[PDB]
Amino acid sequence: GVPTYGAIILDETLENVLLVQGYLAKSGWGFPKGKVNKEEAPHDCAAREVFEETGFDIKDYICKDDYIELRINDQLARLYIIPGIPKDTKFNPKTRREIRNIEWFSIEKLPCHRNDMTPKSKLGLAPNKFFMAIPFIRPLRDWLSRRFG
Numbered sequence: 001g002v003p004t005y006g007a008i009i010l011d012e013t014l015e016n017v018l019l020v021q022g023y024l025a026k027s028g029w030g031f032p033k034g035k036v037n038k039e040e041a042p043h044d045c046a047a048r049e050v051f052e053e054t055g056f057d058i059k060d061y062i063c064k065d066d067y068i069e070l071r072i073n074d075q076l077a078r079l080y081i082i083p084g085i086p087k088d089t090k091f092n093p094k095t096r097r098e099i100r101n102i103e104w105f106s107i108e109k110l111p112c113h114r115n116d117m118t119p120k121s122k123l124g125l126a127p128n129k130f131f132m133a134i135p136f137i138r139p140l141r142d143w144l145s146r147r148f149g
């Protein structure tokens with residue numbers, strides 16, 4: 001699969017993260033990210049996808065070594081960590097045909113796993129609108145503890 005790049009943007013307090021909500025298959029909440037183009041450097045793809053989805057340019061803030069990367073079903077997703085962005089920043093996507101809404105979420109309230117259905121003796125996981133963000137939440141909380149305390 002083609003690698004994806006984007007950002008985990010936090011506010012000044014470090015307790016909120018910015019998620020975006022797409023449509024249809026991308027109908028839940030997730031970190032802003034997208035597929036890398038031919039010859040495009042990972043930091044440039046992250047800034048482009050982030051600016052396409054939020055209107056906010058992270059180029060002057062990206063730190064090369066500060067990211068979380070996960071391999072999910074043989075697709076690599078790397079989100080550069082971008083703290084300290086004021087909560088009153090005006091985010092607007094470029095294409096409202098792709099992004100429904102953009103919101104800050106409390107990190108501590110976000111789930112870091114989906115729930116089973118052991119109540120119902122049924123296998124699998126219950127739907128959760130934060131499905132795409134979930135895999136990054138525990139690695140983020142651990143990264144913030146290490147790098148900030």
Ligand SMILES: CC(C)n1ccc(C(=O)NCc2ccc(F)cc2)n1
Pocket residue numbers: 020021022023025026027028029030031032033053098099131132
């Ligand atoms: C399996 C399905 C649920 N899926 C695939 C990708 C996403 C996702 O990333 N959702 C949030 C999102 C990010 C970028 C964007 F441009 C629009 C929406 N969700």
